[PDB]
Amino acid sequence: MVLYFIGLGLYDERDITVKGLEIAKKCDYVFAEFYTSLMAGTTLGRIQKLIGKEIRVLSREDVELNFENIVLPLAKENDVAFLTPGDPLVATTHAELRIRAKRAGVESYVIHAPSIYSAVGITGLHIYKFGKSATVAYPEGNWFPTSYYDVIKENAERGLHTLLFLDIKAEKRMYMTANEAMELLLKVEDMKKGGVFTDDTLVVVLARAGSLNPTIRAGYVKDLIREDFGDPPHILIVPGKLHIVEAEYLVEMAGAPREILRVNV
């Protein structure tokens, strides 16, 4: 009788850790959610096949409102696993679900998996240099979110990089591309005019991290805004002050304009 929060990784069913696979294989019941992120290189079938279990997929409402009514009950008698894309507790509210488990008298364990948060390391940007992170959310109705713009500004002022998670509307199957994120940011810049995100701003795009051939592109907004970066998911990064070796990597590995080699110190 226990509950396991098991991450599935970045792209496909093989991104799960060996620890996660072996424990997942021996659980009595297996639940999962696929709304907090997109695993573009797999399907539910391949996942079930790999674990050898039927996986009951839950909606955001099932989780946020009925986790303790659907999942916890079975944990009191059996070994249950709750699967999620990437790492279970990263850029989600899943951590709080452990508190519900405790209050229900259920012990929980966390099995980590590759996360986009550390995968950004493949962009060549020093991970210790990333500042506060933010999410570019789709405007809805008359409400136009802009907080993420202020985050970039705050980090940029300190010479730190900014990781931008992109919005997702799972039930509509809508995944925000880096192109859309860029369009929204220019509109915010037009509104606030803080000189934070313009046509000349250098940005980095990472698409489908975890796959063997992710798309990694670095360049000025004016040139990348209409570029095709392949299928989702995508994340956008606005680097801060670059180190020489970071610039070198962007140019050699991400096709960045050879001119960024000339870092203003």
Binds ligand SAH (CB under 6 A): choice among 3, 16, 37, 202: 37
Is residue 37 a known part of a binding site? no
Q: Assess 131 for contact with ligand SAH (CB under 6 A).
A: no
Task: Show the site string, 167-206: x = touches a copy of itself by CB under 8 A, - = not.
Answer: ----------------------------------------
CB atoms under 10 Å from CB of 85, counted, come to: 28
10 scored as a contact of a copy of itself (CB under 8 A): yes
User: Is the Cβ–Cβ distance between 169 and 177 less than 8 Å?
Assistant: no
Cβ–Cβ < 8 Å for 10, 210:
yes
String marking each residue 36-65 x if it binds a copy of itself according to CB under 8 A: --------------x---------------
Q: Measured from the CB of residue 210, what is the shortest distance to a copy of itself in angstroms?
A: 6
**105 dihedral zone (left: phi>0; alpha: psi -120 to 50; beta):** left
85: alpha, beta or left? (left if phi > 0; alpha if psi -120 to 50): beta
185 phi, psi to nearest 5 deg: -65, -40
- Residue 39 or 190: the one with the smaller Cβ distance to ligand SAH is 39
The answer to the question of whether 79 is labelled as a binding residue is no
* Contact pick of 42, 133, 201, 215 for a copy of itself (by CB under 8 A): 133
Q: Answer whether 40's CB lies under 8 Å from 234's CB.
A: no
Site for ligand SAH in 69-108 (CB under 6 A): 85-87, 90-92
Euclidean distance between CA atoms 172 and 243, whole angstroms: 40
Q: What is the C-alpha separation between 160 and 158, in angstroms, rounded?
A: 5
Q: What residues contact residue 57 under an 8 Å CB cut-off, 6+ apart?
A: 31, 32, 33, 34, 44
| Closest approach of Na ion to the CB of residue 135, in Å | 13
Q: Which residues form the interface with a copy of itself (CB under 8 A)?
A: 7, 9-10, 12-19, 21-22, 50, 86-96, 98-99, 102, 109-110, 112-115, 117-119, 121-122, 124, 126-135, 154, 158, 160, 165, 209-210, 212-213, 245-246, 248-249, 252-253
Q: Which residues form the interface with Na ion (CB under 5 A)?
A: 130
